[PDB]
């Protein structure tokens, strides 16, 4: 499983990125992987801002990585070591290249470690993507460093063609010297997010062209909405909804060894107190605000603050948790550090308390039986809490 | 540290590092910055619960085999989505809801627990709720191992239970809880807010107060009375797991030399939810001088706890060095770490003993007798290896006959 | 010799049962071409607020919505109901809401409901796979209904037709702890309405339909958006419990396979849809324009049972004497049974053609005869210039002057 | 036919086919042509075994799970390759090797399992096994074969191999060494051809036998991996329990999770004990057939199929064997002296759904949708899926308190 | 998981092939899939001579097969669906297809059902096959006929599967002129099967769905640097299982390689979760067979080129001749599993001998002479 980091952990506070890198077609921003919750998760959180026309270039990372698409719309090639190119131009009258799919607003995307991809903004809209790169994985035989490695443009040569000399590549892609060091994209300025020239065009259903295991490779779906409604696994009209996504949901995540949970809380409501049985959280907060309580082991309050849009909070594994929504209602995408995560909620319906006996709540907290009968069955509902 | 890597010069029995006095009992912990367990990656906890009392209810984030060494009593275990299948429902009940023209959605139910007894061994599944509640007549001792390496745990080496109830025994700007419950060591519910935990849980502040209360009671507490109201048997479908088998050499054993003694393995090919854990335990029974065959474990750590008895124990290393050569009494703990190679001979009363071991399915070789290694080798090999006649070779071969793992002395008749 | 198949047939239902709020249509599960693949095929048409009733079957089931949009409750026994109302009123398992272009797989023994809540009819067609392992009980298919008074599919104390019908009153009220008329009235001896039935008003159940409402007014108008730039191109709760059971293999945007202007096919299987490994089932959707040709291709490991949702396509197959054992049009509605191993060919007519194909693997594998990826390209170019007496120059030909995979236009047939 | 299609109208209590009288006991045999065991692809054999008696070893190609109703005993079983780990090598053999020893140069076996009351014991198909009631009573053993088990590739004709004996004759079918020529046998054993003569004997002792020579020189604990599996538990509900009501009684579920052979049997058991006029829950097994055998007390059983019929209507006792279909609905009303019963049924991980109670598929729909299925009202439909509270599979009697 | 047969057997019989297909450059031989032996077995033999230049056209079956080579040697080219081409000519001095392998004496080579393959011989002398058909196998979901569809020639004497197309379906597909997408119905093609190539054949080579290209599909059971079980006077065997080659976990499948020396014994054992196909090399052994009620159904001989069942449980004893024997044994599983009945490890040896005594009514001399007198296991010497 994981290599393991250090969790002392006497302080969370929430976390915003501390450094951006702007590309002429967008801005990177990159989370403190020292800040010791991530650290002692095992994780860096990245986020991409890709402006209209903006295609993030295609790179690959030691990390495998979950990514959430925040907001906006447009299409990922993930580039699948082996496999035919299976999309293809009409040659009885081109292109030719491995299957894209449309993502949108609510996606998860995973890939596994060391595979390339890109990413095109297709719509008008900014397109947001939060990606976790679980750098403590099995997957990651090098270290904590979550590396990218780019095979285009200069995101500093610096793309993987840059080092090798220009002989090698006019050989290996049997084309002359001019062609070969022109993927060495010494000249280019753009950064890791370009604009393409017009349109970009690719082959895709009704879109016409114009002027961690190998066992399933090939046919992965690498893809699930998490946040449709009507994909909710828990859902309370005063409370909100829940939806986790696992290996039961979608089998890649059985080889990634991730999880994810998304999770929108009405005005004032609450997510029952919990702890996670066998990972890590890393919640990042899309919308609203909410209330956010950390505990650890000894009995001590770590995070006693809210977590705005944009931010984002650790909760390492078995601390106990609890959120309640402000006003606005909160809504927010936790990256999970392992296939099937579990919540053991600690109230309500499904909880430890429920399945521990009234008289060992009575000698444990020395209250009357009327009381433990209450602490155990007044909040009869699951895991959201309506207000 | 040269102790985390196992390159010790010498190992010796270990000693628990703390002793903890409850209300209820006693808890002695064998701390992980102990040399042997940073080499071993392990805790140990003795537990000796007086009777009538239980366990505060905890959790921890690494796998736990428990070996109940006397007494009996109940184990809860909670698995987060299983149903309560223990109830009390009562007749009463079902005529009041029928007859009322009235049930819908608008006296006790419990998950499963489990009787446990002298020579059970017990497994925890790494953050799995647990408690125990000593019913019977004699102290409850528990001898507990967690894995602290195991993939389960995620967080680091430092052995962390939380407590959801008691506590240490004694005879964008924050918003202060931290400062607030401080008026060493709480239960989880004092670190949340007492108007939350309120709210969430539907019922008055009042019994919010009396469960964050400093309760100097400690880890283990005598209840009021007998505690009747709990459902029990003698009074995916992963809720169905069995959690406890008694090792009890008498009643199953894999290994039975008639005049030298038992070994009963329970591994994931009896006890299934080790698999899982990636642990298991191993219960032997030496008659007075039997021999344990020389051997190495290929795939495991173990720490062994002394039940009865005594034995001189030897252990060396990939040097050729002894690095543990002691006599071993009742209630001893010491670590024989993977691959070292160990041999035991018991004392003039025999020698039982209890072996937690850091994989769910146990390779170990032997050196000695019907399946050893040595028996593998072609008797020219060990002739030209050991410069030794092949008559020798032969002897080393054959001379132990049908005995394997427990080797009657050689020596001292019975 | 149950696919000792001299001639194949494109086969339509032969036994229809009508409701009160619906109708189910059954193929011949004893003719000898199903007897062959090991199925039984359904279709089932439900009106707007039709309920069709509680009901399991003996075999696994692959549904693939045709038409329409409505909802359906599976019932996993033991899972916790995670759907409710505020506390203060109904309380129940996870919704799951389907759509035009859904595949749906139901294991066998697994008790379902299904509502059209929408305002046109659903149309779902059902591949029972009941040579699956999973039924020990009959190769005939079962339906088992908790609720209603049905009458049996595949043919034409209590009285009625389900389940409770067998058991006395008295104990059903005992075992329910209710009133002995409520336990009599669980036999639906007095029920004419038959498998489906009318919901009168809305059914009511703890859903999110608001923001389901706001979800697809957002995906209608990116449809809108994306059509427009087109045209101007020119606890264990949480894991087992929550097991996913449906995907979209209609949706236009996706494809597993693509030959721009003229084809696109789509497959679900066990590396896209868990479940499936425990039904050792999978599916295609196929797209064909006019022209679009399927090449010759074989099923290594399954059978396909081959649905035609609309247009036209002339199939050949071939078996392993070379013979002709299908040579026709097949038409919207029809379906046809390949065996495992068969070579087949579809050739779209001008209208075009959609089929989806129930496939009796988890994880169906074909190879095609021709184009990239072949059988014919994996060959050395001796190999096949001894082996049809020809040139390596000829051969060379046959296996590189087609440069798509799969799909491809066809001008001469 | 039909009846191998669980095409029945109409199930019955089966009756023991035959019964074998040998020296040592009696076999009684349901065999699998019985339409209710045709359906369920199952046979049955309950063996009585007298005190200080012996079955012969034998073997067969399908796995069998075995409920010991009555007395004590020790089981073998043999698992090819793995080392005899059971010996009793003594200091005089250890000293008169070290005095002067090799390879060209009192007995050791595979391990014996104590069984007893209460117990199932998993006999792989294909291994061989014998039993011996050591105790003053006796012994009892009720198994039950999956004859449509992948592990058998025969067919579904009852086909036990015995190393020793034959059929009985007065207090045909030999062993298979009577087909081996004798003189081939004792060259590949090494042995004396008249040892050989002496298994090929035509036995007329039977299946079971008495031990007429003392059997105190077996290893006996009670005096690795693969080798190392388990193959008994009990199964008493008092014990261990999955579901436990107070006032309705107790099942205890043996599946793969708590014995992991059972995974490779794909076979499991249930153990239930429901107290006076308790119900189980009315429910549908999805992936397994069930063989029922009563061991106290008794009860009202009723079972539907796909349309509607009752199937069948029983009030069964003590020594009953009955049959509930795959799929087949069943509830079950105890006496009012209680009831219990053993379940064999033919998945390692069996999975039902339940249609009363707290965790059944009635309370997962949702309250209108029961109302239109049933054309009842939503407060009907309310206490369908509420009136029975907190109980699940054992159901309380809602009439006779007590 | 397997298909069911009918196990009724009062007689086995060696078998030989009934019938008999000539090829231009060789002859494929048919054992009787309709022989209650085969049928309880669920299986069917097959036997390829294929002349020195020789070679065996593209086909695949429905059923998985096993395929032993007796003797020869020569390239087998397997075609794995969707896998890329990764032999190759050098593009600045052609050729291009996917991987081939060295066959030769010994090997087994595994097919899963539905893959296409060819065989050509590439050595001096005959290629000998001998294939079992493992037609109730649960990867064959057609029936008992193991089928042969063939992707070149004409084997009926068009009959390959590019016959039952049409010209212009082909001529489309392939992307050619109609004359050359004739050609692919081989229509006058009269030369069967295995056909002699121009000259030598030219090749490139060296001088379930998860394993993606990359599974080993052959491994060599006679060489015996690689036996299981060796006695200088007995003999030796080599077993096949998925612990040894991934791919027949998937196609449930077995194979043994068995030498026994002059006069030696295999000892008496069952087959625990299979059924075992005889087929016999090289030499003769007596082999005796007893069924579940103890009744001999095979008391004779086994010769070169003959084959025989023995179904899964029954209980079976072999001795060679005076010059040894040779066979290779398939069997209908994934880790088939023998329990011998006499020897070191045997089920005799693992009873108390108590339990024997009163068993066979011995004294505990002779029970212990039973048990411990024959201390060598599975193969005997003389
Ligand atoms: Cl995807
Ligand atoms: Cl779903």
């Given at each position: ?5 250090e969790c ?22 990159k ?13 860096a ?29 447009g299409?990922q090639?993930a ?5 035919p ?17 449309q ?5 998860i ?6 595979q ?22 099995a997957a990651?035989?090098?270290?904590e460093?979550?590396?990218?490695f ?14 090798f000399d220009?002989e ?20 280019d300025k753009?950064?890791?997010?370009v604009?393409?020239?017009?349109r ?10 114009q ?5 399933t490779?090939?046919?992965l ?15 309370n ?6 939806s ?6 979608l ?8 999880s994810?949970?998304?999770?929108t809380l ?5 997510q029952a107190?919990?702890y996670?049985?066998?990972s890590?959280?890393?919640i990042?907060?899309?919308?609203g ?5 950390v ?6 309050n ?19 948790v ?5 006003s ?20 309500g ?9 009234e008289?060992?709540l ?13 602490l ?7 895991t959201?809490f309506?207000? | 540290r ?6 010790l010069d010498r190992?010796?029995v ?13 808890v ?16 140990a906890?003795?537990?000796?619960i007086?009777?009538n009392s ?12 428990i ?17 309560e ?7 009463q009940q079902?005529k009041?809801?029928?007859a009322?023209?009235?049930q ?6 419990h ?5 446990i ?22 102290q ?8 602290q ?10 052995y962390?239970?939380?407590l959801?109830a ?9 918003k202060?809880?931290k400062?607030?419950?401080?008026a060493?060591?709480?239960n ?6 007492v ?20 309760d100097?009671r ?10 009747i109201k ?10 169905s797991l069995r ?9 199953q ?8 003694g038992?070994?009963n ?10 698999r899982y ?6 219960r032997?029974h030496?008659f ?7 051997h ?9 706890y002394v ?22 009494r009742?209630?001893?703990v010491?670590?024989?770490p993977?691959?070292?190679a160990?041999?035991?001979?018991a004392?003039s009363?025999?020698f ?14 032997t050196?000695?007798?019907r ?33 394997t793992?427990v080797?009657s002395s ?5 | ?13 032969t ?13 011949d599960?004893?003719?000898q ?8 095929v359904?279709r089932?048409?439900?009106?707007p607020?039709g ?6 079957s003996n ?11 409505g909802?359906?409750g ?5 899972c ?6 505020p ?11 389907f ?6 797989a139901?294991?066998?023994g ?5 509502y059209?809540d ?7 067609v ?10 020990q ?6 339906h088992?209904?908790?609720?209603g ?10 009285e ?10 008295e104990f ?5 702890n ?14 004419k309405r038959?498998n489906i039935?009318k ?11 608001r ?14 958006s ?29 494809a597993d396979?693509?030959?721009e ?27 064909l324009?006019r ?20 247009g036209?396509?002339?199939?050949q ?8 054992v ?20 579809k050739?779209?007519?001008?209208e075009g053609?959609?089929?989806?194909a129930?496939?009796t693997?988890?994880?169906?594998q074909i190879?095609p ?10 060959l050395?170019?001796d190999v ?8 390596r ?6 296996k ?5 995979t ?5 001008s001469?047939?």
């Open positions: 499983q994981r290599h393991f980091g002392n952990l006497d302080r969370l506070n929430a976390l915003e990125p501390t450094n951006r890198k702007e590309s002429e077609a967008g801005t990177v921003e989370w403190d992987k020292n800040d010791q919750q991530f650290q002692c998760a095992g994780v959180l990245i986020r991409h801002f890709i402006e209209r026309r903006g295609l993030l270039l295609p790179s690959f990372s030691n990390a495998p990585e979950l990514i959430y698409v925040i907001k906006g719309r299409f090639g580039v699948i070591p082996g496999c190119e299976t999309f293809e131009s009409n040659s009885n009258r081109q292109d030719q290249h491995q299957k894209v799919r993502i949108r607003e609510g996606d995307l995973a890939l596994p470690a060391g390339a991809h890109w990413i095109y903004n297709d719509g008008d809209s900014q397109l947001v993507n939060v990606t976790l790169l679980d750098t403590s994985n990651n035989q090098l270290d460093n979550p590396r990218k780019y095979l285009a443009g200069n995101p500093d040569g610096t793309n993987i063609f840059s080092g220009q090698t590549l006019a050989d290996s892609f049997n084309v002359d010297v001019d062609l070969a060091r022109r993927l060495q994209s010494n000249q753009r950064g890791k997010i604009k393409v020239e017009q970009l065009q690719i082959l895709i259903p009704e879109r016409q062209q002027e961690g295991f190998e066992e490779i090939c046919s779906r690498l893809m699930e909405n998490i946040a449709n409604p009507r994909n909710a696994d828990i859902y009209p005063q409370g909100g909804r829940i986790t996504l696992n290996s039961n949901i089998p890649v995540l059985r080889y990634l060894q991730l994810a949970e998304r999770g009405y005005r004032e409501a609450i107190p919990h996670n049985l066998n890590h959280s890393v990042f907060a899309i919308r605000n909410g209330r956010i309580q505990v650890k082991d000894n009995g001590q770590i995070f006693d603050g809210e977590l705005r849009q944009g931010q984002a909070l650790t909760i390492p594994q078995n601390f106990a609890i959120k309640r929504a402000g606005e209602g909160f809504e927010w995408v936790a990256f999970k550090t392992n296939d099937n995560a579990q919540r053991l909620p600690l109230a319906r499904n909880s430890a308390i429920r399945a521990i006996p008289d060992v009575i000698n444990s907290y020395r209250i009357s039986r009327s009381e433990a009968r209450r155990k069955f007044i909040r009869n509902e699951t959201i309506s207000s | 040269h102790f985390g890597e196992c390159n190992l010796n270990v000693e628990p590092t703390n002793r903890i006095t409850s209300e209820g009992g006693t002695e912990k064998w701390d992980t910055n102990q040399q042997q367990f940073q080499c071993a990656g392990v805790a906890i003795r537990r000796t007086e009777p239980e366990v505060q209810p905890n959790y921890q984030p690494a796998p736990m085999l070996y109940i060494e006397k007494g009996r009593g109940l184990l809860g275990v909670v698995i987060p989505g299983c149903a299948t223990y109830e009390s429902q009562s007749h079902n009041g809801q029928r009322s023209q009235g819908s959605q608008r006296q006790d139910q998950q499963r627990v489990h009787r007894r002298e020579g059970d061994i017990l497994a925890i599944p790494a953050g799995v709720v647990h408690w125990i509640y000593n019913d019977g007549d004699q409850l001792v528990a001898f507990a191992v967690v894995n390496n195991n993939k389960a745990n995620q967080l680091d080496e430092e962390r239970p939380f959801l008691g506590g240490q025994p004694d005879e964008q700007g924050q202060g809880q400062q607030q419950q401080q060493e060591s709480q989880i519910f004092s670190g949340f807010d108007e939350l935990l309120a709210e969430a849980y539907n019922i008055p502040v009042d019994i919010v107060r009396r469960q964050q209360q400093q100097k400690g880890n283990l507490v005598k209840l009021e009375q007998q505690q709990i459902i029990r048997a003698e009074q995916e479908t992963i809720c959690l406890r088998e008694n090792m009890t050499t008498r009643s054993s894999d290994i039975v030399s008639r005049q030298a038992r070994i393995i329970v591994n994931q090919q009896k006890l299934p939810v080790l854990l990636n642990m298991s335990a191993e032997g030496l007075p001088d039997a021999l344990y065959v020389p190495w474990a290929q795939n495991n750590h173990r720490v062994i039940i009865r008895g005594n034995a001189q124990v030897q252990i060396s290393d990939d040097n050729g060095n002894n690095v543990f050569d002691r006599e071993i009742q209630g001893n010491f670590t024989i993977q691959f070292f160990a041999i035991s001979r004392g009363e025999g039982e003993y209890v072996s937690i071991k850091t994989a769910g399915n146990p390779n170990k070789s050196l000695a007798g399946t050893s290694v040595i028996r593998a080798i072609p008797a020219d090999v060990l002739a030209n290896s050991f410069q030794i006649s092949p008559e020798e070779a032969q002897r080393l071969k054959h001379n132990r006959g049908k005995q793992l080797l050689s020596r001292i008749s019975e | 010799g149950e696919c000792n198949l001299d001639r194949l047939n494109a086969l339509e239902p036994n229809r049962i009508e409701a009160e709020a619906g109708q189910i249509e059954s193929w599960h004893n003719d071409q199903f007897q062959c693949a090991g199925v039984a359904i089932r048409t439900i009106e607020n309920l069709l009733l509680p009901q399991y075999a696994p089931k692959l549904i693939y919505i045709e038409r329409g949009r909802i359906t599976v019932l996993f026994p033991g916790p109901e995670t759907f409710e109302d506390q203060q009123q109904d309380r129940h398992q996870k919704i799951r809401h759509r035009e272009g859904d595949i749906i139901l294991p066998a697994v008790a379902h409901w299904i059209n929408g305002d046109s009819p659903v149309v779902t059902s591949l029972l796979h009941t040579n699956n392992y999973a039924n009980l009959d190769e005939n298919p079962r088992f209904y908790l609720a008074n049905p009458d049996d599919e595949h043919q034409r104390q209590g009625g037709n389900n389940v409770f019908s067998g058991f006395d009153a059903l009220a005992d075992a329910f209710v009133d002995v008329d409520t336990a009599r009235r669980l036999q639906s001896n007095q029920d038959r039935v919901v009168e008003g809305r059914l009511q159940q703890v859903r999110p339909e923001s389901r409402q706001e979800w697809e007014r957002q995906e209608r108008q990116e449809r809108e994306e059509q427009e730039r087109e045209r101007q191109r020119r606890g264990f709760e949480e894991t087992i419990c929550s097991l996913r059971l449906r995907e979209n293999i209609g949706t236009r945007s996706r396979i693509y030959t202007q003229v084809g696109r096919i789509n497959t679900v299987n066990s590396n896209t849809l868990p479940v499936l490994r425990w039904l050792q089932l999978s599916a295609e959707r196929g797209d324009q022209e679009g040709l399927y090449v010759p291709h074989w099923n290594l490991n399954a059978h396909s049972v081959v649905y035609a949702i609309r036209r396509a002339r199939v197959v071939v078996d392993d004497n070379g013979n002709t299908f040579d026709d049009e097949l038409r919207q509605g029809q379906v046809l049974t390949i065996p495992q191993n068969f070579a087949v060919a050739r779209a007519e001008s053609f959609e089929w989806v129930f496939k693997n988890d994880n169906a190879s005869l021709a184009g990239r990826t072949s059988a014919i390209r994996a050395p170019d096949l210039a001894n082996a049809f007496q020809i040139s120059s000829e051969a060379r030909r046959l590189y002057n087609r440069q798509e799969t799909l491809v236009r066809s001469r047939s």
